[PDB]
Design a protein around this ligand. Structure first.
Ligand SMILES: [Cl-]
Lengths: 205, 175
């Protein structure tokens, strides 16, 4: 995986946004991990998050003319991503978000990149799509923080349903698979820990 | 004289024509106009948080949570928190409301609100009532510009501050 994906995971772990262990999901299943981007709730958590969404966006190479964040959760995420693009990528993108009710910022025109936290059932995307549709712009992509890569009600994932229903690509910072790589790519900790302690014991303090 | 950040903010806000001086009518009259909703690019937003952050640091007001009223306060609070963290090493909990309820960090201690103009009365007062109803205190409200304020200041017991003043705007346009 690339550097930003590794640094995202570590950051999510540091902030307790990502956690491993036993977890009962409010949506049936028992899961081995918990992920809740809502815990990125301070100014430095947001700065970093804008920068990780921005990195993921530039990595995809998808061209977009406006970054749209749906009310309400998409608003801060679009905001910090837009900021990360101006200051760290020298990309000055128009940005837009809606009021529930009607548009703040730029016009919804051309290729629209929707940014949000997660794709649960595709709800926020459906209302937004009706705004894009209405404005005769098209949905070029949706960017979320994590792609869980698991079957839903049927056989397609929640992301795959969004792709089918709206015709856009879904972009994620990271995926279940990255979480496995990350875990599989760890330097046998207790092995090195003991050797480091042993080396210390003989040369320490 | 006005500080560097104050001069730079006026210059910024005038270029984008988001800030205007003249004679305007609100739904009552005003000598200035400012609608942060007119900023339309990420670079605008970037510069915006930095000016709010500079104002907030300069004010020396202590606060535990940065709050943004729906809807315009939300991107303002977000980018202001990003700037605080990035440029001033101040990592502040943030929160905002759904006009619809709260999103972000738990609302506790002293809460500083940020928004574009104070004639954003109804949105700010409600946010303010909502903060209080949640047992947190009000540190103050920071707007981009002012001289309305009197009212909020009387019945909520907190200060209303701004990045710049009407005087600074008029002085700027003289120089
Ligand atoms: Cl608003």
């Amino acid at each position: 995986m690339k550097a930003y994906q590794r640094e995202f995971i570590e950051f999510a772990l540091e902030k307790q946004v990502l956690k491993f262990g036993e977890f009962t999901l409010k949506s049936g299943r028992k899961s081995p991990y918990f992920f809740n981007a809502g815990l990125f709730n301070t100014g430095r958590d947001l700065a970093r998050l804008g920068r990780f969404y921005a990195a993921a966006l530039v990595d995809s190479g998808i061209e977009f003319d406006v970054l749209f964040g749906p009310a309400y959760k998409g608003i801060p995420i679009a905001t910090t991503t837009a900021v990360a693009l101006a200051d760290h990528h020298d990309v000055d993108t128009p940005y837009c978000f809606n009021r529930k009710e009607n548009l703040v910022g730029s016009k919804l025109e051309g290729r629209v990149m929707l940014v949000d936290d997660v794709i649960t059932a595709g709800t926020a995307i459906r209302e937004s799509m009706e705004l894009i549709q209405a404005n005769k712009a098209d949905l070029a992509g949706v960017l979320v923080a994590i792609d869980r890569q698991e079957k839903g009600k049927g056989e397609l994932s929640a992301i795959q349903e969004v792709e089918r229903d709206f015709g856009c690509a879904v972009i994620s910072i990271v995926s279940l698979t990255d979480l496995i790589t990350y875990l599989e790519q760890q330097g046998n900790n207790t092995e090195h820990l003991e050797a480091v302690k042993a080396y210390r014991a003989q040369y320490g303090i």
